[PDB]
Design a protein around this ligand. Structure first.
Ligand SMILES: COC(=O)[C@H]1CC[C@@H](n2c(NC(=O)c3ccccc3)nc3ccc(CN4CCCCC4)cc32)CC1
Length: 296
């Protein structure tokens, strides 16, 4: 019966909104994340949801991890963090019910929606700046509430829909969950002090957000092209930084390099990041820059 605290308030399993199992219907598989499969579902004009499932074959620790994940997501309240409709923990397999994000994960979206001869203007700079603003807004909410994400990366962000008017949200809190209670650490998203001293602060998430910005403006490339985890660790620790993505406007790259200052005190907080993203968004020289066309 672990307690969870956020924003000075303590909650437990009894605070989660249990939805009767008979009201929940699975429609289709949407793929898998940290735990088992995620399904499209509906709760009884039914409510459309994403259903995160816990494998019935799992450890005591897997169970406790799943519970902590439920508590974490249920206590956030922000438009750029996926909502939790509720849980179904009293039937097996256990479910967490979340806001359905019909556009899928941000990394996949960027790779699949790259401008190409068949879809020549599938995305523009403003689409990318809007995604960046959306995630920066969610990050600012976390920072204001003293929550350190620890894995701000494109794979962990989701889109409401594929089309125009999409909203990007933070959708996975697995790293924070593990720490609340190595070839799997997200080395390529971590600042020098994090992988050395294990020191984490909100300026950790600033650094990671810089890497996310690179992922966005590269249209979904893996950070540090051609470098392994240890090569990145040594590169970053020695002052090495990524080059601008193809066609990236200068003002946008400058946000990245500010996010990647060696000393955490020299990195901007998220209020400043949002200010800078807004300035880029209003600058015609930025938003009129054409994205590269991937040949196809
Ligand atoms: C956090 O990311 C995940 O959990 C992964 C990636 C996103 C996945 N996903 C999700 N995930 C969610 O909506 C979601 C995930 C976590 C929290 C809240 C919502 N929605 C998707 C919509 C479409 C598609 C693409 N579609 C899959 C079926 C066959 C054809 C291609 C994938 C969607 C779930 C699994």
């Amino acid at each position: 019966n672990p307690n969870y605290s956020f924003a000075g308030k303590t909650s437990s399993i009894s605070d989660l909104k249990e939805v009767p199992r008979k009201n929940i219907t699975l429609i289709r598989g949407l793929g898998h994340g940290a735990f088992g499969e995620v399904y499209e579902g509906q709760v009884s004009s039914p409510l459309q949801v994403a259903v995160k499932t816990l494998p019935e074959v799992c450890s005591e620790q897997d169970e406790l991890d799943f519970l902590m994940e439920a508590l974490i997501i249920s206590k956030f309240n922000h438009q750029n963090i996926v909502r939790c409709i509720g849980v179904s923990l009293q039937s097996l397999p256990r479910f967490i019910l979340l806001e359905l994000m019909a556009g899928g994960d941000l990394k996949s979206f960027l790779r699949e929606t790259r401008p190409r001869p068949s879809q020549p203007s599938s995305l523009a700079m403003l689409d990318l700046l809007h995604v960046a603003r959306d995630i920066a807004c969610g990050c600012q909410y976390l920072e204001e509430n003293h929550f350190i994400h620890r894995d701000i990366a494109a794979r962990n962000c989701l889109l409401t829909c594929p089309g125009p008017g999409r909203v990007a949200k933070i959708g996975d809190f697995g790293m924070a969950r593990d720490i609340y209670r190595c070839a799997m650490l997200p080395v390529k998203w971590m600042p020098p002090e994090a992988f050395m001293e294990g020191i984490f602060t909100s300026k950790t998430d600033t650094w990671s957000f810089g890497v996310l910005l690179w992922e966005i403006f590269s249209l979904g490339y893996m950070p540090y092209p051609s470098k392994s985890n240890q090569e990145v660790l040594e590169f970053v620790t020695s002052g090495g930084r990524m080059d601008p993505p193809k066609n990236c406007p200068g003002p946008v790259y400058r946000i990245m390099t500010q996010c990647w200052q060696h000393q955490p005190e020299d990195r901007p907080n998220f209020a400043i990041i949002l200010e800078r993203i807004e300035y880029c968004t209003q600058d015609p020289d930025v938003i009129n820059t054409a994205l590269p066309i991937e040949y196809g």
